Amino acid sequence: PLKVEKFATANRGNGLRAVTPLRPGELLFRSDPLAYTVCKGSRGVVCDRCLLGKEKLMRCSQCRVAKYCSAKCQKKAWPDHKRECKCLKSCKPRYPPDSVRLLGRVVFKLMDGAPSESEKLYSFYDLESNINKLTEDKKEGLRQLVMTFQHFMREEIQDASQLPPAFDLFEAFAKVICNSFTICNAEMQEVGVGLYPSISLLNHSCDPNCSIVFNGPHLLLRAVRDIEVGEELTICYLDMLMTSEERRKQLRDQYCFECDCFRCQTQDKDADMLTGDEQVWKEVQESLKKIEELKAHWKWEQVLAMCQAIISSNSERLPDINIYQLKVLDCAMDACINLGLLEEALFYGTRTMEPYRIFFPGSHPVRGVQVMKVGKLQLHQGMFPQAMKNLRLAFDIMRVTHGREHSLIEDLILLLEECDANIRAS
Numbered sequence: 252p253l254k255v256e257k258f259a260t261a262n263r264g265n266g267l268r269a270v271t272p273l274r275p276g277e278l279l280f281r282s283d284p285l286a287y288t289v290c291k292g293s294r295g296v297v298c299d300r301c302l303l304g305k306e307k308l309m310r311c312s313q314c315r316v317a318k319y320c321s322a323k324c325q326k327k328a329w330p331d332h333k334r335e336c337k338c339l340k341s342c343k344p345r346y347p348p349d350s351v352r353l354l355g356r357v358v359f360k361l362m363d364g365a366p367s368e369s370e371k372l373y374s375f376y377d378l379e380s381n382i383n384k385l386t387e388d389k390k391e392g393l394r395q396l397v398m399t400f401q402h403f404m405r406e407e408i409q410d411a412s413q414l415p416p417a418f419d420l421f422e423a424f425a426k427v428i429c430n431s432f433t434i435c436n437a438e439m440q441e442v443g444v445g446l447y448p449s450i451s452l453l454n455h456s457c458d459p460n461c462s463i464v465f466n467g468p469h470l471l472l473r474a475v476r477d478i479e480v481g482e483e484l485t486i487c488y489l490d491m492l493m494t495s496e497e498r499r500k501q502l503r504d505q506y507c508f509e510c511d512c513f514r515c516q517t518q519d520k521d522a523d524m525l526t527g528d529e530q531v532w533k534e535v536q537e538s539l540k541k542i543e544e545l546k547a548h549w550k551w552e553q554v555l556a557m558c559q560a561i562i563s564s565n566s567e568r569l570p571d572i573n574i575y576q577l578k579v580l581d582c583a584m585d586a587c588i589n590l591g592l593l594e595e596a597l598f599y600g601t602r603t604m605e606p607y608r609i610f611f612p613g614s615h616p617v618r619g620v621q622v623m624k625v626g627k628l629q630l631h632q633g634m635f636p637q638a639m640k641n642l643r644l645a646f647d648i649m650r651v652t653h654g655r656e657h658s659l660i661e662d663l664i665l666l667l668e669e670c671d672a673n674i675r676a677s
């Protein structure tokens with residue numbers, strides 16, 4: 252018995268609404284992807300199948316592009332990799348855009364696979380394309396993706412009889428652009444891109460009543476507020492650390508809509524997000540383009556070097572509540588954790604705690620993860636009362652956003668028991 256149902260909204264296309272009253276933390280839907288792939292930066296760093304990082308990965312011998320954590324993952328991935336393998340090998344050394352590799356997997360799944368549970372409420376065929384809202388520049392970009400797909404897939408798909416009935420590649424890429432999900436690992440690093448057509452029914456809010464979280468490729472949809480019968484379910488499509496102007500640009504560019512929510516009408520939190528000297532944070536925002544690229548490719552030493560030059564600059568500095576400063580602290584923290592620089596990681600992480608309380612109101616999985624990271628760093632440094640407070644706060648958030656079905660909650664329970672045993676021996 253589903254707790255959610257598809258419906259036709261008055262002015263947002265189709266949507267999802269509650270069939271029963273919902274409480275924070277309630278699991279509403281869970282889904283594997285219709286199709287997914289590792290993303291550009293994480294290719295060869297994480298396993299193609301389970302999206303977990305490993306010090307050494309085994310490569311597919313035929314294409315040498317797909318890489319796996321284990322013989323189990325390589326073999327289990329073979330049915331969904333078999334046809335793309337010949338295309339990837341034929342295209343070497345050229346690697347396709349993520350969207351092109353993704354749509355290849357969509358096509359093979361729809362041609363060769365049984366009907367997917369991911370499409371229970373809504374299918375790839377049903378997805379919004381927004382084609383009549385596309386500007387000419389966007390249509391041109393989609394045409395180039397179509398031609399890139401035809402080149403990449405030529406070994407496996409030569410004509411329309413090898414595509415699903417009435418399949419239009421331009422329309423398919425339009426759907427991919429507006430309906431791709433960024434798959435994040437347990438630490439909230441972007442590691443993949445996938446299509447989850449039933450989850451695509453969720454419309455956007457900058458102050459949503461639901462949240463999604465990834466456990467490998469698996470997606471969990473949970474309520475994060477009380478929700479009444481008939482009430483529309485929403486998620487936030489975007490990073491919370493964005494001004495209303497930034498959200499406006501991305502929602503127009505990628506999703507072809509103008510957001511009418513209260514936060515956008517009132518520029519909610521914009522002024523607090525942009526405190527400090529504008530010339531300074533404009534420079535930091537510029538530097539973050541490279542920092543974000545380095546982080547996406549797991550280049551932690553390079554990330555840390557650039558972040559330290561900002562955090563410890565000889566020149567003017569920013570308040571930690573400035574969102575570009577905050578992003579630099581976040582990246583520096585994550586780099587230090589991955590490099591084993593645990594004292595420095597804790598310094599940066601502790602500084603983010605109050606800004607995160609302000610910018611992630613309610614129960615948000617990203618703040619849950621951040622607080623867990625800080626609590627774990629404090630546990631390792633022997634600060635048991637401080638660690639316990641943060642681990643308990645992380646649990647209060649993550650019991651709602653992640654839940655028992657997410658493996659990170661089991662990890663958190665072990666940290667809480669270890670911290671508690673230390674306190675009791677003191």
Ligand SMILES: O=C(NC1CCN(S(=O)(=O)C[C@H]2CC[C@H](NCCCC(F)(F)F)CC2)CC1)c1cc(C2CC2)on1
Pocket residue numbers: 429430431432433434435439440441450451453463486487488489490491539542543544546578579582616617
């Ligand atoms: O992919 C979808 N949403 C995303 C929203 C964002 N999250 S997140 O949980 O906040 C994790 C993010 C936290 C920030 C992190 N970036 C930090 C970079 C900072 C810099 F630049 F300084 F380096 C990246 C991960 C993931 C899911 C989606 C699609 C749809 C379709 C339209 C239906 O809905 N939702």
Ligand SMILES: Nc1ncnc2c1ncn2[C@@H]1O[C@H](CSCC[C@H](N)C(=O)O)[C@@H](O)[C@H]1O
Pocket residue numbers: 262263264265266377378379381429430451452453454455456505506507508509510511
């Ligand atoms: N808050 C919002 N206001 C207006 N349109 C929205 C919206 N959130 C999502 N959408 C629409 O939904 C698309 C994302 S997919 C969400 C389901 C979609 N409404 C459908 O009918 O299939 C966006 O590109 C936009 O067309």
Ligand SMILES: [Mg+2]
Pocket residue numbers: 377378379380
């Ligand atoms: Mg349509």
Ligand SMILES: [Mg+2]
Pocket residue numbers: 381
């Ligand atoms: Mg329309």
Ligand SMILES: [Zn+2]
Pocket residue numbers: 298299300301302303319320321324
């Ligand atoms: Zn694996």
Ligand SMILES: [Zn+2]
Pocket residue numbers: 311312313314315316317332336337
């Ligand atoms: Zn291969």
Ligand SMILES: [Zn+2]
Pocket residue numbers: 456457510511512513514515516
């Ligand atoms: Zn809004």
